Design a protein around this ligand. Structure first.
Ligand SMILES: *[C@@H]1O[C@H](CO)[C@@H](O)[C@H](O)[C@H]1NC(C)=O
Length: 310
C-alpha cells in the first residue's frame, strides 16, 4: 500500500493523484488497492506494455492533458476492473487500437483534442462494452471507415463535435445510441439517409455546423428523437414534413439562422404552434423579407404570404 514519491495517496491507497507535477514517465509503486488514478497535467509521452499490469482494482484512469504520442501493444493489460479511460489533450496521431485487450468492463473512452487523422475499420472491436465515446475536437481528422464503429452495440453517447466533417459517417453499427453531438462541422448538405439506423437516438446536436440545406426525409430514421439543435447554421427553410414522423420531438432550437419566411415555411409555423404552443412570439426570427423581419416563425400564417402548389 505504498505511495509513489510524486503522488498524493488518499484513503487506504484507493485514490491516487499525481497532477500538476513535471512527470516525464508513468511513476512506479502504485498500490494494488488503487481504484482511481489521476496523472493529468504532466509531460508523459509514452505508455508501455504492462505499465499497469499489477492494478487489479483500477476503475478510473486519467492520463489526459499530457504529451502522449506512443501507446504500445498491451499497455492497458491487467485492468479487468477498469471502467473509465481518459486520453484527451494529448498528441496521438492515430487511434490506439493495439493497446486494447477485450476490456469488457471499459465503458467510457475519451480521446477528444488529439491530432488523430483517421478512424480505421474495426477500431473499437476490442472494447464492445463502451457506453460513452468522445472523439470531439479531432481537427486534423480526414477519414472515418464505414466499419469504424462496428461492435459498439452498447454505445449510448457519441461526440464527433468540432471535427472538420463534410459528411456524416456510417453509424448503422451504433444501434443503441441515444445522444449524438455533431456541432462544429462542415456539414453543408444533409441527405435523406444521413442518420440511417439511429432509431434509438433521443438528442441530436448540429450547432455551428454550417448547415445550409436539409433535404426532405432527412430525419425519418430518428423515430425516438426528443431534442434537436439546428442553431447557428445557414438554414433559409426546412423541407415539408421534416418532423411529421418524429412524434416524440418536443425541443427544437432554430435560432441564429437566416430564415426566409415565405410559404415554403408555412408548415413549420403550424408545427411550432401544435408542438410548442406556449411559445407565442419567441425565439426563431425571420431575416427575410423586410416586413416579416424579426418576427417569430411560429406566429406567422396564411395571410402573411402567397401560397401555391408548386
Ligand atoms: C420557445 O421559448 C423558449 C423559452 O424562452 C425558448 O428557450 C426557445 O428558444 C423557444 N423555442 C422556439 C422553437 O423558438
Amino acid at each position: 500500500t505504498s505511495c509513489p514519491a510524486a503522488c498524493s495517496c488518499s484513503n487506504q491507497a484507493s485514490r491516487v493523484i499525481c497532477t500538476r507535477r513535471e512527470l516525464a514517465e508513468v511513476p512506479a509503486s502504485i498500490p494494488v488497492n488503487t481504484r482511481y488514478l489521476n496523472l493529468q497535467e504532466n509531460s508523459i509521452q509514452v505508455i508501455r506494455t504492462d505499465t499497469f499490469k499489477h492494478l487489479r482494482h483500477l476503475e478510473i484512469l486519467q492520463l489526459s492533458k499530457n504529451l502522449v504520442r506512443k501507446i504500445e501493444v498491451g499497455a492497458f493489460n491487467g485492468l479487468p476492473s477498469l471502467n473509465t479511460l481518459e486520453l484527451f489533450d494529448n498528441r496521438l496521431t492515430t487511434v490506439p487500437t493495439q493497446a486494447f485487450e477485450y476490456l469488457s468492463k471499459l465503458r467510457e473512452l475519451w480521446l477528444r483534442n488529439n491530432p488523430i487523422e483517421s478512424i480505421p475499420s474495426y477500431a473499437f472491436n476490442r472494447v464492445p462494452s463502451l457506453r460513452r465515446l468522445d472523439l470531439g475536437e479531432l481537427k486534423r481528422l480526414e477519414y472515418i471507415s464505414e466499419a469504424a464503429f462496428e461492435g459498439l452495440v452498447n454505445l449510448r453517447y457519441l461526440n464527433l463535435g468540432m471535427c472538420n466533417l463534410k459528411d456524416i459517417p456510417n453509424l448503422t453499427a451504433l444501434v443503441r445510441l441515444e445522444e449524438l453531438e455533431l456541432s462544429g462541422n462542415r456539414l453543408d448538405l444533409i441527405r435523406p439517409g444521413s442518420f440511417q439506423g439511429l432509431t434509438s437516438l433521443r438528442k441530436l446536436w448540429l450547432m455551428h455546423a454550417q448547415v445550409a440545406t436539409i433535404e426532405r426525409n432527412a430525419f425519418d430514421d430518428l423515430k425516438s428523437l426528443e431534442e434537436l439543435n439546428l442553431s447557428h447554421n445557414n438554414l433559409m427553410s426546412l423541407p415539408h414534413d421534416l418532423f411529421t414522423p418524429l412524434h416524440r420531438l418536443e425541443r427544437v432550437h432554430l435560432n441564429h439562422n437566416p430564415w426566409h419566411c415565405n410559404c415554403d415555411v408555412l408548415w413549420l409555423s403550424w408545427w411550432l404552434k401544435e408542438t410548442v404552443p406556449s411559445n407565442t412570439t419567441c425565439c426563431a426570427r425571420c431575416h427575410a423579407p423586410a416586413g416579416l423581419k424579426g418576427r417569430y416563425i411560429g406566429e406567422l400564417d396564411q395571410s402573411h404570404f402567397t401560397c401555391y402548389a408548386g
